[PDB]
Amino acid sequence: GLVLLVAMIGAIVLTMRHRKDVKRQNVLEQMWRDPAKTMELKDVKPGQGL
Amino acid sequence: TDFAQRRTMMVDTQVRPNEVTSYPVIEAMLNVPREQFVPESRRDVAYVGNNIDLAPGRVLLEPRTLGKMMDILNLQNGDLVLDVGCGYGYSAAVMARIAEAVVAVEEDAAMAAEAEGRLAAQDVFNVAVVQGALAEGCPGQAPYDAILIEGAVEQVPEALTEQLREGGRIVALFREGNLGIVRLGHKLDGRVNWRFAFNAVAPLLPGFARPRGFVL
Amino acid sequence: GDIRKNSYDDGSMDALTGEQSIRNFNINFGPQHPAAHGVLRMVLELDGEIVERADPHIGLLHRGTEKLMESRTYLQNLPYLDRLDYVAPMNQEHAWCLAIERLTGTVIPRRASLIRVLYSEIGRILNHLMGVTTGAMDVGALTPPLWGFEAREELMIFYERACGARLHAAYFRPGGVHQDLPPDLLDDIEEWCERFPKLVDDLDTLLTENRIFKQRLVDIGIVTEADALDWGYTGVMVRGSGLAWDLRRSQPYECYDEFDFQIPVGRNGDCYDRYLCRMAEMRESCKIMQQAVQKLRAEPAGDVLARGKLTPPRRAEMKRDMESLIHHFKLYTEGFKVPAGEVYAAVEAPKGEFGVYLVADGTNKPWRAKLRAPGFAHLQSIDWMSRGHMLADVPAIIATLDIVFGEVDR
Amino acid sequence: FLLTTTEDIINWARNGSLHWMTFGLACCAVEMMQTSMPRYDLERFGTAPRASPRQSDLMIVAGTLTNKMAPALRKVYDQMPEPRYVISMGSCANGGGYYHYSYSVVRGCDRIVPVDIYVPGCPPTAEALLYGILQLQRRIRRTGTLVR
Amino acid sequence: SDEALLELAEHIALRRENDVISTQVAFGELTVNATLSGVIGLIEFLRNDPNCRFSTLIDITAVDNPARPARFDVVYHLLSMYQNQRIRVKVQVREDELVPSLIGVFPGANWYEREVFDLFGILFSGHSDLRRILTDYGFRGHPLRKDFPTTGYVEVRWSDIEKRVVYEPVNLVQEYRQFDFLSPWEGAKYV
């Protein structure tokens, strides 16, 4: 078990790195997105812009 | 101007997607500055996907045409290449990065002198610019492994195709009215046999027109 | 805004990254590709399936519509509009009619105005059903398109019963609409409107709170207000980011003022928000269809075309009265003349702002007809939008932009 | 007899398992899609879509073929294993249609690939296309052999 | 909106006197004719100025006028969602004259200028990626010029000899028919 642990530590110590320039999503935050909160209907009067 | 970004974009979007796979050609086109080989007034449009006008009736071919033209010649490190109508020498500089040596023939003393100056300023040393009529070629240094004609022709004179080595390749753009066909020729048993390569257009070179007289 | 040279959180620089990039992973994404709509050749540069460059090659459906329009009369050019954003053809016809009506200073009858609103909202549902359910198919959901396209089938039958064609109606005309609607057709549209919200619930039950659907759309293709202004975004592409801009309200046309509907907007401006906005818009369009049918029934009988010097007479008059026969003969051969001038007439098409820039010169044919497709501006931004995402996200991003290439290429 | 009844079995299998490439060019593709939707359910005939030409027996040219697109259509047709059948759907593919006199349009897809059936309309209705597919099946039954 | 557009046109003419040649309000739309040398500066002012906040580029196109010394018009359509107004900017361009690129202001101008270059042959200076966008690869000519034929010059066919799709000169089984319906009577303009 310790021989296998040393392999776990070594592989991560030697090689781990992450691109910091790509787009990432937090899966739990994706699943928490509430449709009721993220979309809403607006009463826009005629002739009215932003 | 960031000509490096424009050069990379030209190769990515005008050369790679047009069936140009030869990496020597892609490497060469990514490195030879196109704007250094155009008249000063055309410098900002050096990387546009069109023929650049050099002199009346003479152009610097569009990047797609040249990329595909060089890709099918399939140049080797030991090749001696004849570049007919080199203009300011852009095409010769690109081929010089692949072939052993290039003999660039230009007919306008103004462009031939500018080609020498610009070729030297880019430290290109396996390109000799020879001044004379395009239809004659340069028979002094013949035979050549490959011949590239950098403008539309109606016929390629026998004198020009005799300077081609047996097994040599010649690529020319043929003009039939509004239609332009790039053909690839192979010298076999002394005869150059032409085959369709792809469709592209350019103005006719002076001296390559065909004999056209009265027909009832 | 350039990720081709990988940047790592440990600052490492690989030996190969030092060399100039000559041998890159380039792949043709389309034209023959289920997610490419048949005529998109997008060249993708991938790095471990990360999209580092997207280079859309378009024009594979360029047919020279704007050149062909210059040798035809204004009436002969009306069917060309059907075939641009061909998922909802009458909505595109509307811009052409509005431009001609503005230059000629023509007022269309009240009933024609109500019918135009009615069938414009049918087109919006026709488009949003296609967009939402084929967008679901792009992220692997097989069933939603089958349910949605059954409802589309019913709406295409309403098209055919109005004009005799399921898709390319040629129904909106300069001066109104070609023909009046049968009374039994209005009954059937009302009956369909009562069922439609049930399908929207069923699609919502299948997709909206599915965890897989959320993980394929939430925080994908995020658009900020500043991004919208870079790339000429219109329609749901701006509303998904929270800008309550809708041409039917900001720059009203036809009789939209007197209808009751709301503008859905998103808060995060991602693919999930734009999906919710389109689902909500489908509900709003159904309500408009219900109001329009009620107004049409409450209307007094009237004509659907302005007649006069702009449109042909009725066939019975044409066969009886000398003036009508002349106007029929002339308007079907020469057509009306449009006074010299230039206008840009825009509508809130289902895919965004669609406009016609019409240069008239006093003759019976347009001098120049420039067609402004919302998808042209939306597709141009795919390189910026897709940079940094994975290859699996590309079909979702193509879906969220709502591209039809009849209008991108023209 | 043996050989004719063998061809009948081959024609029966090929008609009952006619897989078409996922390939739609323009607004004819909208009606082609409706043909596979619940009202008509093209797949109930065994006529199912296939994304890859290597698994396709049938190409439906559904939309305008431009000059820029013509090489791509020819390529994927060339990559269909044999037998391969082609249906020309709609005016543009049949003869150029509304864009016949354009500078950028192929005046009929039979200038690029051989065609088995022409379906008229602009667009043909979903039912008209379904009729055209069944006419192709009659043609195969009438003339089908092991070659095609 | 007519008084509003005339007031807005004076504001632009005043603040950008040298850019603006003239303004017009016709059919409820404001058009600004600008010099070629000042078009980028003017469009930048229109984008950023408080009174006129034209932060959406609707499109760029060209119009061909062969009877005119400067045959081309380049037309910029801009929308303001915040002010809720539209404007058109027109510049006259001679054949072979270069037009400064708008991509510095609007990244989305990139494709519109490619389309103008493709269909009219107008080159833009300062363009990062200027190549044909709608016509076939290696297309000869600019189809939206009034002197380019509708059917063009060449057509494609699959050649069994070359095993390629090749170009050939156009041959029409039925020649294009161009009916001339226009009447010799203009009609009256009654007062």
Ligand code: SF4
């Ligand atoms: S034939 Fe008609 S419906 Fe079919 S693609 Fe052509 S224009 Fe569209």
Ligand SMILES: [Ca+2]
């Ligand atoms: Ca990389």
